[PDB]
């Protein structure tokens, strides 16, 4: 018996940012998130619509400590965020630890760089063993956040090419 990995059957997904971190003005947050989805849709037939309310496949929220799911946060440092694999309810949701200081620059914990990674999970990717890949578990930032060939091959193996 062989089991496949969690996938979205549709290629058009809806997302919603439930709340905003006080760390950045709302404009920066929206842009960091929108830009992260754009990285993935660029290499696949996947499209993402942002809904301001109502149903959404990918629910994005900034929380801290125990937030009713089964992977509570740990305060500053350590785990910065986590996202769930495709599926109903929690499936596809991305959670960011409010206890971290989220930024829009080189200062530790650039939101966009982390969002790009967790969104990889929301679409079905697991971690990579390549320190150069976006799907690597460790926080790394060089100013620019682009997909490594490993992330590209990974996502395309599931959804196909653009």
Q: Residues within the annotated binding site for Ca(2+)? A: 23, 57, 74-75, 77, 79, 89, 91, 93, 97-98, 100
Characterise 124 by phi-psi region: left (phi > 0), alpha (psi -120 to 50), beta (else): left
Residues that bind Zn ion (CB under 5 A): 69, 95
Could you tell me the smallest distance in angstroms from the CB atom of residue 146 to Ca ion? 25
Report the distance separating Cα 15 and Cα 93, nearest Å: 9
Tell me: does residue 118 bind Ca ion (CB under 5 A): no
Report the distance separating Cα 92 and Cα 78, nearest Å: 22
Could you tell me the smallest distance in angstroms from the CB atom of residue 35 to Ca ion? 20
Which token pair is 8? 């979205």
Beta strands in the chain (DSSP E): 12-17, 47-50, 58-63, 81-83, 94-97
Q: Single out the catalytic residue among 3, 53, 108, 118.
A: 118
CB-based burial, 125-138: b 16+ in 10 Å, e otherwise: beebeeeebbbbee
Q: Of residues 37, 81, 93, 134, which one binds Ca ion by CB under 5 A?
A: 93
* Closest residue to Zn ion using C-beta atoms: 95
The answer to whether 118 is a known catalytic residue is yes
3-state helix, strand, coil in the chain (%, to 5): 25, 15, 60
Could you tell me the smallest distance in angstroms from the CB atom of residue 124 to Zn ion? 12
The listed partner (Zn ion, Ca ion, none) that binds 97, CB under 5 to 8 Å by sort, is Ca ion
The listed partner (Ca ion, Zn ion, none) that binds 93, CB under 5 to 8 Å by sort, is Ca ion
Report the distance separating Cα 16 and Cα 76, nearest Å: 25
The listed partner (Ca ion, Zn ion, none) that binds 69, CB under 5 to 8 Å by sort, is Zn ion
| Residues labelled catalytic | 118
Which residues lie near Ca ion (CB under 5 A)? Answer: 23, 74, 78-79, 91-93, 97-98
């Amino acid at each position: 018996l062989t089991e496949g990995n969690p996938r979205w059957e549709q290629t058009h997904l809806r997302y919603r940012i439930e709340n905003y971190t006080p760390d950045l003005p709302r404009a920066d947050v929206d842009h960091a998130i929108e830009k992260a989805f754009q990285l993935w849709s660029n290499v696949t037939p996947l499209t993402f619509t942002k809904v301001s309310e109502g149903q959404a496949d990918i629910m994005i929220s900034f929380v801290r400590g125990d937030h009713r799911d089964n992977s509570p946060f740990d305060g500053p440092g350590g785990n910065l965020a986590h996202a769930f694999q495709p599926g109903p309810g929690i499936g596809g949701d991305a959670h960011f630890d409010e206890d971290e200081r989220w930024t829009n620059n080189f200062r530790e914990y650039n939101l966009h760089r982390v969002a790009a990674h967790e969104l990889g999970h929301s679409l079905g990717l697991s971690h990579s063993t390549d320190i150069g890949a976006l799907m690597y578990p460790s926080y790394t930032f060089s100013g620019d956040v682009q997909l490594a060939q490993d992330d590209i091959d990974g996502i395309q193996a599931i959804y196909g090419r653009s």
